[PDB]
Amino acid sequence: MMTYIVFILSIIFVMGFVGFSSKPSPIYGGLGLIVSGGVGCGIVLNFGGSFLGLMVFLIYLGGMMVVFGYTTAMATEQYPSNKVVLGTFITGLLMEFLMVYYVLKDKEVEIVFKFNGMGDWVIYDTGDSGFFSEEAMGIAALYSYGTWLVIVTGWSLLIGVVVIMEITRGN
Amino acid sequence: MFMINVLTLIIPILLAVAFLTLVERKVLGYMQFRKGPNVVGPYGLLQPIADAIKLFIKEPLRPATSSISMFILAPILALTLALTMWIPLPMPYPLINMNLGVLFMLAMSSLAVYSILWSGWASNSKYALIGALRAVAQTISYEVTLAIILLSVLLMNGSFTLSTLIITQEQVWLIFPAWPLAMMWFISTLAETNRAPFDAGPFALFFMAEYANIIMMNIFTTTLFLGAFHNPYMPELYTINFTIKSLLLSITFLWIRASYPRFRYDQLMHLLWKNFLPLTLALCMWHVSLPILLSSIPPQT
Amino acid sequence: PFFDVQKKLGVDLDHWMTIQSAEQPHRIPARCHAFEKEWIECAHGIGSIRAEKECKIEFEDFRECLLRQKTMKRLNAIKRQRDKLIKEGKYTPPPHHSG
Amino acid sequence: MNPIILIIILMTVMLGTIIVMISTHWLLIWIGFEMNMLAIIPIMMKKHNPRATEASTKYFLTQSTASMLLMMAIIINLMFSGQWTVMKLFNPMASMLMTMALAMKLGMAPFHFWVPEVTQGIPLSSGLILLTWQKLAPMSVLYQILPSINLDLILTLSILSITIGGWGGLNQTQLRKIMAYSSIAHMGWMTAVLLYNPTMTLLNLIIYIIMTSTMFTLFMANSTTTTLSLSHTWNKAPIMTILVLITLLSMGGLPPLSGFMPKWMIIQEMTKNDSIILPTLMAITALLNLYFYMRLTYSTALTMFPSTNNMKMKWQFPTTKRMTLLPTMTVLSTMLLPLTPILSILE
Amino acid sequence: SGYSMFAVGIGALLFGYWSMMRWNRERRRLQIEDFEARIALMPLLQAEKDRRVLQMLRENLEEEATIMKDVPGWKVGESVFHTTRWVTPMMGELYGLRTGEEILSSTYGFIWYT
């Protein structure tokens, strides 16, 4: 309910990554990655971020986690939580809270960097008169400039199809 | 006043779902020779509201102390998708003027597939789970076809903005420059609503999610291919004719629900891939190669 | 090896994605356009070591355009001094909307 | 496994290596490594044993995390001075992550735990193509980004690669694990020179690829996995014996034979700096990694192990394979001592 | 009736294409009128933009000259950069010490309006 909304969504993003990086059951991992992908889409849309951030949400949370949970469920289940997972989640939460505290009550945080501690509404553009939605025209390339690029991308996709059928018993 | 706008969106949809249940049951009763039933309530309305409170108050025979988190997240996701996804649908002036909304519709359809998978996993390792896995497959194999067909019918809009869609649909409709593509899209909507010919609790809430998804796809149909001319300083005319076309297409959706047998799953996947998917490719490359033929590329503003 | 069939055939497959200050699809600039134009025109025909020892000033200028490190440092020091003197109790400030 | 499909997959391996070589943009470097992975997985599992399945699994996990670490280093590079050119980097952390990604990509001693395992459970054609192309293609990228590397990275990984690929290797009777440990030793020998004169690195790459092609061709002529099978190939045919002799002694790096041109020219353009303790340490470890070559030779063609019969039956049927190119590669790999001023073929 | 149904389907299809072509060309005429609007309108807005950002810069430098008189170093208008060019400000040089409402309306206003 304040200005630091990109920071708050980044904090819940790191919350979700820890929440499935503590190695749970893989369907709970898929749930945690769904939460992380939703709030990361929120981050990239708050930088705006109109086209591409919701574009990938159709793929990343529209075409990937379905197959992930699919092959999760039909391969194995192992119906039983464990103390090591809860301990790793507590250590991840403690690392999160310690980084937040040393961003709040200090100036800079060094891993080997100098992060200026304030929610970045700045830097940001000074409202330039587009009238063409810059990133949409960006992705509206690949077709008048992307000669070699879409050729090798579609080529690798065709090879992906033939690789999948060969490994799953070509022909 | 914006939360009041939210409430005036989400209060009529529950009444819309329950009265859709009475309308589908009585129009089955006046297609197939069962002239009724209408005794409970005058012309049958107190029977749907009592059916809603009956599914509310029903004794549980309670099996449901298994996996609390997944069992509380599957119906909540299905109902929040089905209840939030009339926001970019441009009933005359939409609730949020999203710059791109049809891709947002497709993303929420895939999240409904996630909720189906979560209920299938919460169905506790069963032949019902294998049937739910087949339902996931026959729901996921049509978001290819629906997205590619949607892409080619918005290629005559030029942009995703959907107010450019209501601009394009004033002179003629979008059924005439794409009638086979709209036919295949309508069959894809029959597949995505998971109903005939294409086939634990709270059953009332997954029921709610199904019917709100159907009325979403019908309003999205009526915006996408049909409609009337919008008039500023008179939105009520567009509301009237939009509601009439959506109601007629929902009754025709019932009229195809009644009179066809179900398909075997081999025939369903064979049908999808080996009949729709090359024909979608061919109609889509022809709708790509037509604006360079007719000097009519649509103005992305 | 760094083969240059890229240059031999005369095909500009990889010289447009590459750097800023190229020809964007609509002829629009970047955020730090002129900084890279001056830096590249400084270090064009130079052997990448005296390019370090001679084109360093414009490179640091472009880096402080890109990340804006020292300018955010200055803004942060301004806000911290603002906080300590408003806690001390001097001039509840009317520079916003007034003087 | 139709021949059209095999021609397509080998053409995609060629295309991945060409896209690695030819581009001046980081995205095509990542796409080249990635397409090389995606194509080199079904050269493995040409059989259907679970050995090849688990080997492709191990290779996929290590190769893919190396690719993701590479992409992390490139995104840090664009966080700093922003352009997608293949040149000097602008962060020691980014060059650190990138050299560790390429070190996992082609094998160093903290990273080599996938190499003998993935070479054990695959046939010899897949091992040949993965050794030659997967150790050819990232050497181009290191050759392009050499002016911006912290030296302790390359040199610690190279010293450790030579000594671990030496020490691990005196305890394997399998052929493929011997060849994999030899590959690790030669990756170390190429990497240690890279900040001093990279012509030596590319020439050592050419020599090691020709040597490995001769080695795997002399194992493709007669299906052997253990040294006992090598002694039975002493018994069936005599020319395979003397060529295993000469190619093993040229893997060892002895002066009249053409495996000494890589080591000694590296010694030259290493010691025209003031590094002397590092050449003598590397070359004593080059004395060390010759012993398993020498016991291999004692098994094959110098002593004679007693052979089972049915060689009496195998004598009627001559070795009627086709070799890829055995005699040309043999005489070019072993008789190429006095053409050391073909060093300057390369600039 | 199969040939006749095929013929009437292709006829209605071609009629739809012709009408859509005509309406798209008139639509392109109207979009070129919109471009005329933004072209002829622009320099007045450019002048107002320049005056407003120079006004906030002079105000904020006077504010800094008041607020930092108790520190060593610190000249009042220190250019971070070395070259003497008008670099575009970063909205932190512009919208600083403003406390909340106006900076949320100006920075993130377009992102979560419409």
Place this chain on the structure above:
Amino acid sequence: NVWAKEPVLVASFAIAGLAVILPTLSPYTKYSLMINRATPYNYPVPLRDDGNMPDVPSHPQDPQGPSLEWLKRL
């Protein structure tokens, strides 16, 4: 023949073949390129006064410059 075996596939190949061939032979592709080129997104900048060009008209009403007319002229 093949019309009775798999008709929808043959219809798809036919409409696909016309989608490949047909954009060459058309009286409208050069019109498409002209319509698409002549819409100004950014500002058409003024430039320095004279190299004595018999072009670059000083008034936007002056007809000495390259303009479009075939929008209105069908």
Place this chain on the structure above:
Amino acid sequence: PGIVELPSLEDLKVQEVKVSSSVLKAAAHHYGAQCDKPNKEFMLCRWEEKDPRRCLEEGKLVNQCALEFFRQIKRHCAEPFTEYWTCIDYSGLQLFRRCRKEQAQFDKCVLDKLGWVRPDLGELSKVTKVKTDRPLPENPYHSRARPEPNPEVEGDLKPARHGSRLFFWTM
């Protein structure tokens, strides 16, 4: 480094055009017709020299030209220009195709009492010359000179001195 120079508010006060966006969008083509002959001096100044705090005088001149244009449209024909912009106001995003009757009324008005032929589509295009008074600048990027050229190796080449000059293999 060298501190910045900014003009004070002794100069940065022109009486603004205090009309809103609707009427300013509606009055566009005639603003391009009568005025906007001397704005291209301002715009050429801005595009040649990338420095505001330099072309502000011409900004004052285009601002007074716009204010004189609106004073002239207030004095002469007509009063239903108010009707025209309040007709284009409530039409959402301002299409020029909704309220066209009053555009014809306004054009007949302005042809009756002022002239001012409407610019044809697309005659607010067509890159334009303008004469100036200030000179065209050298080095507008205020940067240093170029450091050093590289001494080019040219001329013919002799056969090498004794071949390789390696350990042996002389010639």
Place this chain on the structure above:
Amino acid sequence: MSLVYMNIMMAFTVSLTGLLMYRSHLMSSLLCLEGMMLSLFILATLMILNSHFTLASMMPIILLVFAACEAALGLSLLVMVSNTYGTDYVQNLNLLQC
């Protein structure tokens, strides 16, 4: 220094450790690799958005399509491993020894 970059790089290191240390499963390891992919996607996309570097906005979409087909290959390999066994543990891969 755009503070959100700090927590996103922190999330990258979190997903990297989740990839590297992993117990008795491969689907969770591949899913953490997918999370690391998402981290690289978000980080590169915030960079390209704030820098207005418009022509090379192909990096996020091409990064994600290529690493998505990587994930597809990994799922096919996991299905092959679980086909030649009963389960898909990190255990029972103990053959083909070093």
Place this chain on the structure above:
Amino acid sequence: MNLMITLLTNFTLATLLVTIAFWLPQPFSMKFFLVAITFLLFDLEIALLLPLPWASQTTNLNTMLTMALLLIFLLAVSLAYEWTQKGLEW
């Protein structure tokens, strides 16, 4: 964040509804597997295709025509490849 307001209001309404509804009672097939991966690959190529209508206006329309037809033609090549090589059957 206004759609976040809508989403939060509908999530709270649905959550209160579900909590009232719950706190007031008063083997495997490989043929199943290939469909998901085939979905994954064709949906990735959909993600390549679908920024075509934003691209529909540019200076070089023939290059866009060529590469767009190459994209859909490769999609049809892969589909017809697995069609002829008897993969997706039952």
